[PDB]
Design a protein around this nucleic acid. Structure first.
Lengths: 143, 100, 50, 116, 155, 110, 48
RNA sequence: GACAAUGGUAGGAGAGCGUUCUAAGGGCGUUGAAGCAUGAUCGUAAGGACAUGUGGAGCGCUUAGAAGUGAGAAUGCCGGUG
RNA sequence: UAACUUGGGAGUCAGAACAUGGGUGAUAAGGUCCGUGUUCGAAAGGGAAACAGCCCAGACCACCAGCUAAGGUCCCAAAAU
RNA sequence: ACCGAUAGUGAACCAGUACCGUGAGGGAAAGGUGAAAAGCACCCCGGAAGGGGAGUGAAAUAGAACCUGAAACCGUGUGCUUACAAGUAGUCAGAGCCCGUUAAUGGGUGAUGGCGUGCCUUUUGUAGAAUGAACCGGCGAGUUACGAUUUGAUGCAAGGUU
């Protein structure tokens, strides 16, 4: 047995700044998901977090295809009888653009105690100004 | 420096002065073994490719010859009155690398 | 009506967490010297001096 | 003659209670409940010894794919290239090299990418 | 058994009408203090064997001893009265093992008297031999004349 | 350290343990006042066992009461008495009268 | 020689006991089947 | 040193482990037997040793013989305690 | 690579789904009764999200070795954005 | 080559007696200090009970609720661990922290990840909301005698055997 194992004494996490200006929603969330999980590092370990931090700017300028701006709706239940609400994807982009990308990427992560910790390394903004300049974020191009 | 050696159907990454555990070999205690098949010679020095570097053998010294810790094998099937119990101990050979 | 399952020791000891006894309010008497319940009369001497 | 049952029953039940050390609650004290968990743990270990060899091979391929894509190449195209040159290095050793020795791992990618 | 135990004629309770198990008597096998299912019974253990096989098993014991130099023929016994110490001194002259079987033509009270007390010593007659005594004895001491009698009987 | 044991008391162990927590680890002078002004049925009995342990510390040995602390205090279960209460329609229900063993240990921490 | 007795080869065999575990093969049912007349204590039909 | 076999209920066949007693042979015990408690020990399974504490008078081994010889379930029987 | 004869000991007589040739019903039923093959019964492992009968395939034991079947390669989730 | 206190007579104890029934009748539970009573004079707390010293004895963790003293169950102290979490409670992988054994590819605890719907009985088919068990201990079910048949072993043989 000689397989390597990563611990919290040799892991390095960096900060990225991705831009969502003119990008497809589903095809952009699938790439950010692998970064938050650390699927791009050669020292990947399953039982420990090894991903990095990601910052999404220009979220309000995401793109859809076809008529999905009206046919795609989001439901939610309040646990009360008959308490089911709804909202269309087109109306949500115009009010809460950050919750649109935040929930689209959270659904591509595992629903475990470690997956909830990896989903907090994400930051989404509707403009181009982020307050995390101290973290020294580095630009990233989608593949 | 290091090298990949094939011994018992597996491959290993050995350095000079390291302990390893392989399948039961033919040599007895205190003898000297020699790894005929070397797949890779790594490090910063001159490396080589494949399938097998002709020559560049490895030398070791046999230290011990024992049996791994006992393993218990049990199986059953519900509602059928069928069970089985077994014991197992895997033999091994402990070596020590001398020079690559 | 009747318990479906028996109660385990782990569950029984958590319910008895708040089943504790209280420590009374006692202070040293100015004249008796023994301990006394506040606003009561010293059993040892009999003085209150309100 | 009469053969009474003594000292043979308690010796067999105590060997089962010692194999259940660490279990929760009555599963490490009572015999009938601890006897059923030791039987199920033996069936679990028999199955996990075979799954153990699938979970580690799945991890070596995940690390080789991450290093191969650092040279702008896929895992499927790198494995094919290595096979053509007859290198014959398993995935457990390619993983151990890509992690520590990078310049050595880079030589295997040019030799494999030359064979197309 | 069920019928031999004392009492237990009536039924403890009726068949139905409660959460108890049905019973028929307080002296059943599963009850404490009542009834044995299959226990010992007074019987014999002896059996027979063909007559020819009996004589062959006896001749095999006598030959087994001579194969070990364990047979000694003496002249006779002149014990006037019963003295145990005198008999013990006799066994020391012949240099015999600790267990000895003595054979005689016919009953001899003095020869049996002066020897029955010594440990590991057994005395019998020519026609009263069995495979248990011959096999148990370490050595065999038989009289000269008695030896010829045992010969004609075994034929 | 001196010890004193009160065997076969007629109070249920669960009820005795309620007062044993108020004095475990306190001083030999503040534990007597707590047991006195309390209004539980186990206070008088527990107090007579603590007064005999402090007497054993200065008569058998010679330790000053000024340097005495309650080291260990616990209660164990003794034999039980089986009693029966008649119920409705010819039924009977068993009743248990439990006993306790009270142990007190005083030490000077030296 | 009473401490070294040895019977003949193939002249003695040990009896079979039923209803003493599953590892023997003659345990719970003991070799009678399942819920029949021939499985009840007392016998079955007469020879003819 | 070679090739070939080994999922399994109802059932058929074979080889074994352990318990109490008996007959021979050879051995332990107040310088501490059986039983009990603890441990990181050995065998392919049932099981077998060793060390320490408790205990205070009996008990192993070898071959063979004879059986009231192996327990988790029967709304099972009795005792104890939740 | 079996088959047959003589003798010792058995168990079984409640079956199920799928494909296919038919009766019955209404070219209804996870219906019912027969012909033929497979699987379950007494069969773990992989696939069909979960799912005895469907698809692939029959576990003597151990290994942190390799090649394949059904089915697959954007993320959950191993493999072509 | 019978039992050894749930065994052996219902009864090893003063047992056909406690108890139950109008009555004829039915019917238990209860053995063990030590070789020797040598059965703890005396002091202390307390109304007593009980207890701590002293003493007896080889031993009082042998003090009459008295040989040995298992499990269920009830308590006290402590090394590691736990208050964002969806758990047939285990198994495989695996940091950190505390230890050091019948000496060997060591012992305890477990942040986090993969997989996983108890057991028995009965059924074509049961995680089943079909049956059974509150838990621990003890007891608790193919046996024996006379006949028949078949196989193995053994002696003798146109004879064999009472």
């Amino acid at each position: 047995r000689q397989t390597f194992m990563a611990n919290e004494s040799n892991i390095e996490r960096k900060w990225y700044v991705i831009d969502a200006e003119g990008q497809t929603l589903g095809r952009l969330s699938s790439e950010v998901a692998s970064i938050l999980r650390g699927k791009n590092k050669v020292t990947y370990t399953p039982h420990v977090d090894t991903g990095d931090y990601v910052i999404v700017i220009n979220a309000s300028k995401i793109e859809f295809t076809g008529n999905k701006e009206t046919d795609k709706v989001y439901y939610r239940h309040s646990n009360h009888p008959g308490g089911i609400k709804s909202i269309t994807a087109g109306e949500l982009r115009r009010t809460n653009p950050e919750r649109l990308i935040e929930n689209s990427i959270k659904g591509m992560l595992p629903s475990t105690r470690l997956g909830e910790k990896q989903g907090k390394k994400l930051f989404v903004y509707g403009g181009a100004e982020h307050p995390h300049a101290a973290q020294q974020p580095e630009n990233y191009e989608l593949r | 420096m290091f090298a990949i050696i094939e011994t018992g159907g597996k491959q290993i990454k050995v350095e000079e002065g390291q302990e390893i555990f392989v399948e039961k070999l033919d040599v007895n205690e205190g003898d000297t073994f020699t790894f005929d098949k070397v797949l890779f010679v790594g490090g910063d020095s001159v490396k080589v490719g494949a399938p097998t570097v002709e020559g560049a053998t490895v030398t070791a010294t046999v230290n011990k010859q024992g049996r791994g810790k006992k393993i218990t094998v049990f199986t059953y099937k519900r509602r059928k009155n069928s069970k089985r119990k077994k014991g197992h101990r895997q033999p091994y050979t402990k070596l020590t690398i001398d020079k690559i | 009506a009747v318990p479906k399952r028996r109660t385990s020791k782990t569950r029984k000891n958590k319910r008895r967490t708040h089943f504790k006894i209280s420590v009374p309010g006692m202070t040293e008497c100015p004249n008796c010297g023994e301990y006394k319940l506040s606003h009561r009369v010293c059993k040892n001497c009999g003085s209150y001096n309100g | 003659p009469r053969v009474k049952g003594g000292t043979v029953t308690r010796a067999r039940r105590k060997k089962t209670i010692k194999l259940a050390k660490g279990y929760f609650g009555s599963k490490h004290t009572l015999y009938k409940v601890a006897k059923q968990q030791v039987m199920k743990s033996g069936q679990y270990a028999f199955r996990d010894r075979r799954q153990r060899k699938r979970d580690f091979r799945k991890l070596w391929i995940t690390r080789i794919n991450a290093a191969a894509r650092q040279h702008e190449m896929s895992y499927s195209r790198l494995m094919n290239g290595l096979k053509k040159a007859g290198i014959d290095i398993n995935r457990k050793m390619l993983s151990e090299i890509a992690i520590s020795d990078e310049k050595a791992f880079a030589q295997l990618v040019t030799k494999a990418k030359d064979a197309l | 058994n069920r019928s031999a135990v004392s009492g237990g004629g009536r039924k403890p309770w009726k068949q139905k009408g409660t959460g108890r198990a049905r019973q028929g008597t307080i002296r059943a096998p599963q009850w404490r203090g009542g009834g044995i299912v299959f226990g010992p019974t007074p019987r014999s253990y002896a059996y027979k064997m063909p007559k020819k096989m009996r004589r062959l098993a006896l001749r095999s014991a006598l030959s087994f001893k001579v194969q070990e130099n364990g047979l000694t023929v003496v002249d006779a016994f002149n014990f006037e009265a019963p003295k145990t110490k005198e008999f013990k001194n006799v066994l020391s002259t012949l240099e015999q093992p600790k267990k000895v079987l003595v054979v005689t033509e016919n009953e001899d009270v003095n020869v049996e008297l002066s020897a029955r007390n010594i440990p590991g010593v057994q005395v019998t007659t020519a026609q009263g031999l069995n495979v248990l005594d011959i096999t148990n004895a370490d050595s065999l001491v038989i009289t000269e004349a008695a030896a010829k009698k045992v010969e004609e009987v075994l034929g | 350290e001196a010890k004193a044991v009160a065997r076969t008391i007629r109070i249920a162990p669960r009820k005795v343990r309620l007062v044993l927590d108020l004095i475990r680890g306190k001083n030999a002078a503040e534990a007597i006042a707590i047991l006195k002004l309390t209004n539980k049925a186990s206070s008088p009995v527990i107090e007579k066992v603590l007064m005999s342990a402090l007497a054993n510390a200065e008569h058998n040995y010679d330790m000053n009461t000024d340097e005495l602390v309650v080291k260990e205090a616990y209660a164990n279960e003794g034999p039980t008495l089986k009693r029966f209460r008649p119920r409705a329609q010819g039924r009977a229900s068993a009743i248990n009268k439990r006993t306790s063993h009270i142990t007190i240990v005083v030490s000077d921490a030296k | 020689k009473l401490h070294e007795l040895k019977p003949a080869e193939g002249s003695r065999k040990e009896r079979n006991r039923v209803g003493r575990g599953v590892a023997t093969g003659n345990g719970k049912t003991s070799g009678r089947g399942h819920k029949g007349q021939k499985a009840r204590s007392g016998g079955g039909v007469r020879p003819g």
